[PDB]
Symmetry: C2
Subunit: 295 residues, 2 copies
Amino acid sequence: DPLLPGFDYLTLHTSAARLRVAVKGSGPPLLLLHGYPQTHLAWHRIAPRLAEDYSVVLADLRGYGESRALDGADYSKAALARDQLETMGQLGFERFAVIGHDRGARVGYRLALDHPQAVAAFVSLTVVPILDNWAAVNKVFALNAYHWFLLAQPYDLPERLIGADPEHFLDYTLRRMAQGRDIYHPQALESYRRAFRDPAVRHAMCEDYRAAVGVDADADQADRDAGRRLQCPVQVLWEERPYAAGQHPLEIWKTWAGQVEGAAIGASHMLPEDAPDAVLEHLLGFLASHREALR
Amino acid sequence: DPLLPGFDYLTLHTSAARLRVAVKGSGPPLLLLHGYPQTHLAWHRIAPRLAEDYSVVLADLRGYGESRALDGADYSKAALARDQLETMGQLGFERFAVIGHDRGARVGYRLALDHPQAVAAFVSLTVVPILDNWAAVNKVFALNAYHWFLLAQPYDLPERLIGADPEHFLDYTLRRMAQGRDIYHPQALESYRRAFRDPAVRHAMCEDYRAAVGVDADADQADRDAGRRLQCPVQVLWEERPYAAGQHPLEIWKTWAGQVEGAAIGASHMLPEDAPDAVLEHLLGFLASHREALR
């Protein structure tokens, strides 16, 4: 079966970037933002169903997939959030919903915090804000999430290590993230592979991880200091696994937003590809219940 | 000037290993154990002065330098501590002092805990027990010490990453550890380089880091559970830098031993090569004050 039947592939030119987007549908707009180490194809099992009722926009994040900075460039969440405002603006949308997974949910919440008039609703798949992740670091988190600390090392240490046999590191990572499950469509896999083989993409990924340690975390701290919260309805869909005290995703989001719901999904971290029907059921229910927000 | 003038280079055959040792001197025995990513040459600025008054034994740790396991082998601190008992035994010593740096101080304290009748005195350069290190893990520790979490990843992930351009990773690490200071004698450097270019050595280093997460930490927990402490005089020489509450090396050692002294040294982590005269002053003073222990 076809990946993204009827999606129109575009390149958009912004002030700081050349961005790959794919679009389909009619009605209220939804922007869907993939994570690491993937691309917009990560949404292939979800986006077509959504395009039956909504305007659907899929982007590659700056530096990932086929999207690229024009330059020394800024790969901070704030900067990639600006990319999203400009992308949706050009396509004709000043206000829209945002559904993110992994790094894209990080671009998502930054965008909703910086530009609350632009974000109608926000869905996070598997993510809480980086400020909360950093406070929870301990031995087992650093082991499970070792790459968060390797990829943030100064330029060019991690680029040299991951750049040696790129496809091997890519595949290993993907298998680990999926808990060994056969969820990667063979054609989407070659797309994830060719991006990771591009040294520019690997560099942009490292820059993302550096920004997570630094400027992104500073931004989140300044918001918590100001008591600034997301102003729209929020849904969080999380991986079913134990959460320590204070680390439950629903409880964490409730400290960032006045209007929060969510649900556990019995699949791996890679929710879009591993549990698309479960996710879709919750997404569709959430967007329906908040159709007034989308107006 | 010559590295290790008058040291006799030996190979010793134990039950589980083929070990490189270098020896010189006469009088009470001292065993000196290097750290990562080095070899016994790391002691070249200290060992000759000590051999003027003591029997001096330098070893390469199992898997590092020219030492190797006979096999699937065990690279846990307990196992390498057994190597030390056997090495000193063969050379004619049933009881001896132990001076360790970095990983060798970890072999050292395990040996002193498991075999208190064999250890007359113990010096740690830059090290506290791994149980204490794990309890202190937070965001900045995982960034500073990223390799502790990369090298512990399942076989063969880290071996593939570090094995790509070995000498480049080796040199980078060495420069980072020395805080950019020109402390590496050009001939000792080629020795550290040729070991790291050996895939067997890189594998043994990863196994060390895995054992630190697992069996080593379990061993330390079981000792603390039993209230078992080192029975000999202890000296700790530490890098002059800020220490958080409960993390001061002197305070930590006092929870592991009844007889503890120490001092801050104004140099980098690589104390044997960066501050040999400062270290020697404290070592010599400590061994002199405890000459009754050495009997």
